[PDB]
Design a protein around this ligand. Structure first.
Ligand SMILES: CCCCNc1ncc(C(=O)NC2CCN(CCCF)CC2)c(N[C@H]2CC[C@H](O)CC2)n1
Length: 263
């Protein structure tokens, strides 16, 4: 696990981009092998070796993945400054359009991007499935899929990243069992988020009420002018039993099929 480490001296920090988990997300430049520097994103933190490990364990696993619709890892870095304290860093690639959730809301404004049509909205769904199909076929659970954690690439392509009660599958709220079908649930609500153009899920119902809300058979409503075929797709990701839920490998094609049927 030494191919992924990059010397700190090859990196400079910039402005704070957002606030992520137990750390800060800032901008910076990374000197590459070929001279050129690159705009990147860095996740900075300590709780003994218990927050260091859980932070550098996503990195050690996420690292050797390859997919266009899954965010890639450019390197991890270790600061060790001032008081005799090591602090770690995760070089992530820069996205000049932020995450999909925020970009969805901006579309609603004049200064924001244009009214996003269905094909573009449906396209984003195809991208997330592709990446979620990838991590599925190689036995990785995301455990936190949401348009908040789906950045937008400059080619208007979506990628999955940042490895929330309204997004937990019903069985995972109880049996503490997160599986690849618990992801299928989350991808269904993320499909709702996108169709609404940024609405907080389950309006009216509150976070604690959610378990009883699901155990009685209440799922998300069909949004305004969301197609029938599209809602029955995201509804199918929600069936009470995990094994009756379709998979990422099937969701993608039905989505890819639906997009073609439009002008
Ligand atoms: C954390 C996993 C991905 C990290 N890569 C990454 N790249 C880019 C950004 C980013 O903010 N780009 C902004 C700057 C460009 N836009 C302004 C245009 C006009 F100036 C707005 C968005 C980013 N912000 C994270 C920060 C943590 C948050 O929780 C998710 C998003 N993160």
């Amino acid at each position: 696990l030494e191919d992924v480490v990059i010397d700190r001296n090859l990196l400079i920090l910039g402005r704070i981009l957002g606030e992520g988990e137990f750390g800060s997300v800032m901008e910076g430049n990374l000197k590459q092998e070929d001279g050129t520097s690159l705009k990147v994103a860095v996740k900075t933190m300590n709780s003994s070796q218990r927050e260091i490990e859980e932070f550098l364990s996503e990195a050690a696993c996420m690292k050797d993945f390859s997919h266009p619709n899954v965010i890639r890892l450019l390197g991890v870095c270790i600061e060790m400054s001032s008081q005799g304290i090591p602090k770690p860093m995760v070089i992530l690639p820069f996205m000049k359009y932020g995450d999909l959730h925020t970009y969805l809301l901006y579309s609603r404004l004049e200064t924001g991007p244009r009214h996003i049509p269905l094909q573009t909205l449906l396209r984003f769904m195809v991208d997330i499935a592709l990446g979620m199909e990838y991590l599925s076929n190689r036995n990785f659970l995301h455990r936190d899929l949401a348009a908040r954690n789906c950045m937008l690439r400059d080619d208007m392509t979506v990628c999955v990243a940042d490895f929330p009660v309204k997004w937990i599958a019903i069985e995972s709220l109880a049996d503490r069992v997160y599986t690849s079908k618990s992801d299928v649930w989350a991808f269904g609500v993320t499909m709702w988020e996108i169709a609404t153009r940024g609405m907080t899920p389950y309006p009216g119902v509150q976070n604690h009420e959610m378990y009883d809300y699901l155990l009685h058979g209440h799922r998300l409503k069909q949004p305004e002018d969301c197609l029938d075929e599209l809602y029955e797709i995201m509804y199918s990701c929600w069936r009470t039993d995990p094994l009756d839920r379709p998979t990422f490998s099937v969701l993608r094609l039905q989505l890819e099929r639906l997009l073609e049927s439009l002008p």
